[PDB]
């Protein structure tokens, strides 16, 4: 009854997630485990392989570490746009005050970016360029000191998050819960957001009980991952300020400028 409506909501979110995000976790894991008929991704594991694959997985004369860092930022821009399209499919979201929709995305998108990045990661590297490339974790760690630790916190989160074995159906609801967070700074009307989130949280709990019946306390673990993601984003913002106060001539995409403006 209420339960049936919660399954219909879960399915609606899954279907909209499929519409919004071209590279799902299911498709990504198939590439990572080599169980797909598609062409294998080009592996970037050192400076030589970067040179060989850079143009295919995409001139300028920036140092390698800066080209990699800024490429990651451009992927983030595309992710923000996909997440925005997904948010608009969450029932109730587009009827919220428009300034509150902006606030929810501004303070939520990076948490979602990290969540979905885990889908593209294993302990050894990350899929890039819509799955056409694979950049190793060791190569990213080898970059000059300001940039050599930029991805490592994301890998650390991802290995632990991926141990929970969530699928795309689980992730669709988890992401929606995060977007509909009523405690973001400057929200004008918190109650309608909390009401939507309460229903999404009920849908998530039922999804996890049905889809992960042997995974004790998985719901509580995911609530804790939401808290962890906020701390991860905070640390990332700190690293960016460092990168800004030590590096020079670093163009930042205007969409990221809006999101990072504090």
């Amino acid at each position: 009854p209420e339960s049936a409506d919660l399954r219909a909501l879960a399915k609606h979110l899954y279907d909209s997630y499929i519409k919004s995000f071209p590279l799902t976790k299911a498709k990504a894991r198939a590439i990572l485990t080599g169980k797909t008929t598609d062409k294998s991704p080009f592996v970037i594991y050192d400076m030589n392989s970067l040179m060989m694959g850079e143009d295919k997985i995409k001139e300028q004369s920036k140092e390698v570490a800066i080209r990699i860092f800024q490429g990651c930022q451009f992927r983030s821009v595309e992710a923000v746009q996909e997440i925005t399209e997904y948010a608009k499919s969450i029932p109730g979201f587009v009827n919220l005050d428009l300034n509150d929709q902006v606030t929810l995305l501004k303070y939520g998108v990076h948490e979602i970016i990290y969540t979905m990045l885990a889908s593209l990661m294993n302990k050894d590297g990350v899929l890039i360029s819509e799955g056409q490339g694979f950049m190793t974790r060791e190569f990213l760690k080898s970059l000059r000191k300001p940039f050599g630790d930029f991805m490592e916190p994301k890998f650390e989160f991802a290995v632990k998050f991926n141990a929970l074995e969530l699928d795309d159906s689980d992730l669709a609801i988890f992401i929606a819960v995060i977007i509909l967070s009523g405690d973001r700074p400057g929200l004008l009307n918190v109650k309608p957001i909390e009401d939507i989130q309460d229903n999404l949280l009920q849908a998530l709990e039922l999804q996890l009980k049905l889809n992960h019946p042997e995974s004790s306390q998985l719901f509580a673990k995911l609530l804790q991952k939401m808290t962890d993601l906020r701390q991860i984003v905070t640390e990332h913002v700190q690293l960016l300020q460092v990168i800004k106060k030590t590096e020079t001539d670093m163009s930042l995409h205007p969409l990221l400028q809006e999101i990072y403006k504090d």
Partner: peptide
Amino acid sequence: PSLLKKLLLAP
């Protein structure tokens, strides 16, 4: 102006 607002309004 807000770029996020523009994305939110573009159907």
